[PDB]
Amino acid sequence: SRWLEGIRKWYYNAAGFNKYGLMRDDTIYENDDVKEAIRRLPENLYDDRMFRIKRALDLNMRQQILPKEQWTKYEEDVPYLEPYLKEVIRERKEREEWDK
Amino acid sequence: YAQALQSVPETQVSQLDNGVRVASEQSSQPTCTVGVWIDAGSRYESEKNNGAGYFLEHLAFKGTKNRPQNALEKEVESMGAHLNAYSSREHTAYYIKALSKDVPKAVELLADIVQNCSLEDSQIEKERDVIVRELQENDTSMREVVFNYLHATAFQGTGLAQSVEGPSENIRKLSRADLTEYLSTHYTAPRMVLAAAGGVEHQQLLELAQKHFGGVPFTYDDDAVPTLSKCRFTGSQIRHREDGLPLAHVAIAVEGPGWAHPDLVALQVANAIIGHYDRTYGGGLHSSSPLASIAVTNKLCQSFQTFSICYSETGLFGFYFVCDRMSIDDMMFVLQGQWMRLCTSISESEVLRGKNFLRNALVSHLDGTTPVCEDIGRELLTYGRRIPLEEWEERLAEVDARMVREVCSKYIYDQCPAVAGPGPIEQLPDYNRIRSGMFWLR
Amino acid sequence: PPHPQDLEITKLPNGLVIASLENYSPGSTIGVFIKAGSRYENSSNLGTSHLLRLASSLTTKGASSFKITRGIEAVGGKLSVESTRENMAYTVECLRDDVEILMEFLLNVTTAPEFRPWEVADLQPQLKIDKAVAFQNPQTHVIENLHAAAYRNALADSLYCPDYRIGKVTSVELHDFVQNHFTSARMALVGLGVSHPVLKNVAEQLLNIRGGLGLSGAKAKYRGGEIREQNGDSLVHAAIVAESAAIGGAEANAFSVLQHVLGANPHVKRGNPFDVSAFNASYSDSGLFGFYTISQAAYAGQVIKAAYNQVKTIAQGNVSNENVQAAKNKLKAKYLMSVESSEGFLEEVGSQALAAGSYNPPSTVLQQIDAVADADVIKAAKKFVSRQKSMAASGNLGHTPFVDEL
Amino acid sequence: GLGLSGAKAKYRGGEIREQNGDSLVHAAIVAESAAIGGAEANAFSVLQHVLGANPHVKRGNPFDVSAFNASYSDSGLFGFYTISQAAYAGQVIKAAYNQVKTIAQGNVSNENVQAAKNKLKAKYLMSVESSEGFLEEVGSQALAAGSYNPPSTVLQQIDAVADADVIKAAKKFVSRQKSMAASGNLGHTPFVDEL
């Protein structure tokens, strides 16, 4: 009856992390996996992400945000790291299982 | 597979009314290799007798009286056979490798050396200064000096402690005689073995040996082989520091059982589990061998190797690593730690691989003719007979976790090890410390 | 029952020669030889071979860098890769049923290398050392340069990635270098301790590429180069050569016997503390022949000179038909001997199952070497003395001469 | 007086390439020749100039090339270095060479000489303004000779030859033995055996 699709859209704008102008992945806390994930990132996307974070920080540090225009739109959010991160995880889970 | 082992040609052996034991293995192979493995060494040397066995090895080729230099070599070269050899602490050998179409010719040659060496007093005075140089070379091979020094302190005071090479003072003064005094004393059939592998037909060998080894034992002595003076193991250290060197080497070890001992198996499996590393490999992902893994992750060593160098009645079960002046410690720690783990909480899944890893070297230990002869040459000499790969198989195809634990601990836990370290080792902690590294705070 | 089982060879519809030989050894070893190498590199992509040779352990599509290494080790396995300017041999060894399993990884390492951009971008700094260790051997140094001074274009290219390119090889240059040389026509799934029906039923999965000859390495133009490396090592290494002999080239065997015909001569021709030998390398469309002379500094001039005069007066009739009989036999030896060790042996059933597709029995391989003698040699030597010479050298050298000083 | 005197310099037709991929090759070619004080010197100098507008204007595209000249005590050198893009390295040196070639086979108006004869008069005099490039002249001579050739005769000497040599100084290059040096991608750059 109620689209998870319809919902995610909610949460996304609700989380409003796009008001700072940074993709979902630009937020995921940096744990062992993510670090390795991000450390596998192509230098392109890396510097991209960096700036997005520094900009985010700079905003946040000013208490002000990004013009309604520059927010990133849900459908246009680029899961730039999810793919690497996943391999990572399974890579690990593969290892963790083998060491038993 | 197991069938492959079983279908492996038994090794033939039969001694002479003389004393020599003649054994060997047959295959299709045109080529082959054959040699006499004397129960001779440095261990059998004295305070003024040390060196000979070597100074010897070094004239063992420059001719005989029957056929002087230019000819022997010319006769060897000319037939395309390779006559090579060595001399350890309790083992010396001289093997040749021809086309099997030379069994009788190679065999003769063999006999003509182990029995009649020119020992040209003029040939000697040259090989004298040759060794004294060749020794000065063995010297900057830190990869080795570190082992002799290990022996030096590990078995301090006894015969093993003396290095196969012998002091410069002896090599500078060994007499035409003393060499002969060595030859005639140790080079005897009862302690020598004629072994070979390739396309040879035992009987043909026998008869040739039985033919060129016309030795005759009168007394009961001649027919008896002296057992060696026991060497006292001495948990201690010896440090030859020199921050002037690229890096330091470290070698620590516990007393080994001796060939005989059946545990040398489980023990051998032990060393299989931590194995060795060496920066060229390709594995921060390596198999269990954490020492390896960890060696990578934390860039611990340039290279490390585990070894159970054993002898007649004693041994040296340890490990040796090479590392930057700076990561020496972390390494020991991590390494020495492994021994503990090894004999305190080792798992089946581990030993499983260990075994197969051994079973791989077990097999590849016998890869070709020369090598096969080696075992035969050895086997008999130190074990009494020949251990078939079918045997070794079971021996180590039956070692469970609990067995490794029970073993290693039996020779490592709370034992006083012997450490040796040349190079910039300022970072290696005193003894007590690497000593209390022998018991796990269980 | 006697251990004899004729080595069957069956050329697949691709060009993938499959050579086996059940010799009944407990430990068998499979090997994928290829006509790849550092001969197919251009002024760019250099060393991509070498690097590749190391990327052996990098994740594939059927098994992760992890699985593979621990996979092979969980069996007492051994994967390794031997390569030469014009050929890369991916061997693997184990025993029993474990051969079957040991395969999965060799299969993936050679055909499904997905060289991930990080793994390599994190593996490249290895070249610095892998090379650094190999270069502790002065000998390898002089040779690397020899080929440089002996050629100009493919082949003359280094075997160990040049420095300047240590971290510039791209994850791409790797696929691109493989997609073009690791192709059925130029590969061979050789092997030992195996039943051929099984070693064949594997080539079925190994069927993932066809392109006969993807990039074919340019012919090798010769050059009379000379490149000295002043570095004062108290002892000079020197090598001299005259282009010649090619694998399969009937003119080959000759030097081999001249290789032996030479040696006791150059050596016994140069008294003092040294070492010297007859150098011989046979490549696909070329080769080399000469002699390297490790010799003390100041006594470097003399040494090479004398070593040379000998290769000289060897052409001007100083070779009894006896010297030939003796030397003809040593090869019979060195050949047969260096075949005992299943790895130096599997190297023979391979080399051939690659360059030809046949297998010259030990009988005729002799009948061919036996085949010539007096007839050549004296002359093979002459070829050296006349043609153009290219020298290589490492050491104090200040006392070592140049080719223009013969 | 002379404590260790440096050995005479034996010539060699060496060739040593340094593969290093710098996107642009540096190449130099030479033929032993000319020595300081050696009457045969000045000739190249004017040939140094007689050459240049020729090799350069002889090789179209994005590059650089010049006439190389070094005069040593008992020897010297003469040739041309050509900084050129990678792939266009082959072509560049080749063309640069043909020019030093056809320069010997009569492609030098007695005018080219007058012009070039003057540029040296210039470059000489000019590079003497700066007391350091100048004190370098009263020195070099006060060392090798013990004299001081006034600016007058130093000209009268360069003025002294022209048509008379040059065409020929070039010839010397094309015949004698050549030694090349090179740094760059090179994979497209030729070897002396390929002229």
mmCIF file of N, CA and C in Angstrom, chain A residues 33 36-38 40-42 45 79-91, chain C residues 117-118:
data_model
loop_
_atom_site.group_PDB
_atom_site.id
_atom_site.type_symbol
_atom_site.label_atom_id
_atom_site.label_comp_id
_atom_site.label_asym_id
_atom_site.label_seq_id
_atom_site.Cartn_x
_atom_site.Cartn_y
_atom_site.Cartn_z
ATOM 1 N N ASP A 33 35.815 -1.094 7.694
ATOM 2 C CA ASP A 33 35.369 -1.472 6.356
ATOM 3 C C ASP A 33 35.343 -0.285 5.405
ATOM 4 N N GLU A 36 38.739 1.033 4.408
ATOM 5 C CA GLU A 36 39.313 0.223 3.349
ATOM 6 C C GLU A 36 38.544 0.500 2.079
ATOM 7 N N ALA A 37 37.222 0.612 2.188
ATOM 8 C CA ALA A 37 36.396 0.898 1.014
ATOM 9 C C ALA A 37 36.927 2.171 0.369
ATOM 10 N N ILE A 38 36.785 3.281 1.079
ATOM 11 C CA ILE A 38 37.245 4.572 0.601
ATOM 12 C C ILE A 38 38.699 4.564 0.142
ATOM 13 N N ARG A 40 39.976 2.419 -1.464
ATOM 14 C CA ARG A 40 39.951 1.737 -2.755
ATOM 15 C C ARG A 40 39.349 2.638 -3.810
ATOM 16 N N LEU A 41 38.818 3.757 -3.350
ATOM 17 C CA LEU A 41 38.181 4.711 -4.229
ATOM 18 C C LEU A 41 39.137 5.270 -5.276
ATOM 19 N N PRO A 42 38.637 5.457 -6.505
ATOM 20 C CA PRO A 42 39.417 5.992 -7.616
ATOM 21 C C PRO A 42 39.730 7.410 -7.190
ATOM 22 N N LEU A 45 36.704 10.334 -7.703
ATOM 23 C CA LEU A 45 35.710 10.374 -6.645
ATOM 24 C C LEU A 45 36.233 10.732 -5.272
ATOM 25 N N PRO A 79 25.628 6.593 -5.102
ATOM 26 C CA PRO A 79 26.180 5.619 -4.156
ATOM 27 C C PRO A 79 27.590 5.258 -4.608
ATOM 28 N N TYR A 80 28.464 6.256 -4.650
ATOM 29 C CA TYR A 80 29.821 6.061 -5.106
ATOM 30 C C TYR A 80 30.653 5.049 -4.360
ATOM 31 N N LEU A 81 30.312 4.757 -3.107
ATOM 32 C CA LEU A 81 31.111 3.803 -2.322
ATOM 33 C C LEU A 81 30.459 2.462 -2.011
ATOM 34 N N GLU A 82 29.129 2.426 -1.975
ATOM 35 C CA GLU A 82 28.421 1.194 -1.657
ATOM 36 C C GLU A 82 29.050 -0.006 -2.356
ATOM 37 N N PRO A 83 29.274 0.065 -3.680
ATOM 38 C CA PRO A 83 29.879 -1.062 -4.398
ATOM 39 C C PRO A 83 31.216 -1.560 -3.826
ATOM 40 N N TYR A 84 32.186 -0.670 -3.618
ATOM 41 C CA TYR A 84 33.471 -1.094 -3.061
ATOM 42 C C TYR A 84 33.248 -1.674 -1.684
ATOM 43 N N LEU A 85 32.653 -0.859 -0.823
ATOM 44 C CA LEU A 85 32.363 -1.276 0.527
ATOM 45 C C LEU A 85 31.830 -2.706 0.554
ATOM 46 N N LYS A 86 30.851 -3.027 -0.288
ATOM 47 C CA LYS A 86 30.297 -4.383 -0.299
ATOM 48 C C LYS A 86 31.336 -5.471 -0.542
ATOM 49 N N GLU A 87 32.142 -5.330 -1.594
ATOM 50 C CA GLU A 87 33.158 -6.330 -1.890
ATOM 51 C C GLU A 87 33.904 -6.486 -0.597
ATOM 52 N N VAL A 88 34.434 -5.370 -0.109
ATOM 53 C CA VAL A 88 35.177 -5.360 1.144
ATOM 54 C C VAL A 88 34.504 -6.326 2.106
ATOM 55 N N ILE A 89 33.373 -5.902 2.643
ATOM 56 C CA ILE A 89 32.640 -6.734 3.567
ATOM 57 C C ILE A 89 32.708 -8.211 3.168
ATOM 58 N N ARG A 90 32.177 -8.587 2.008
ATOM 59 C CA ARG A 90 32.225 -10.005 1.695
ATOM 60 C C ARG A 90 33.640 -10.538 1.672
ATOM 61 N N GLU A 91 34.595 -9.711 1.262
ATOM 62 C CA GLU A 91 35.978 -10.155 1.244
ATOM 63 C C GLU A 91 36.292 -10.598 2.640
ATOM 64 N N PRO C 117 42.571 -1.972 -9.806
ATOM 65 C CA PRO C 117 43.350 -0.726 -9.783
ATOM 66 C C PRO C 117 44.051 -0.356 -8.470
ATOM 67 N N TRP C 118 43.587 -0.917 -7.356
ATOM 68 C CA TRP C 118 44.208 -0.646 -6.070
ATOM 69 C C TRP C 118 45.274 -1.690 -5.854
#
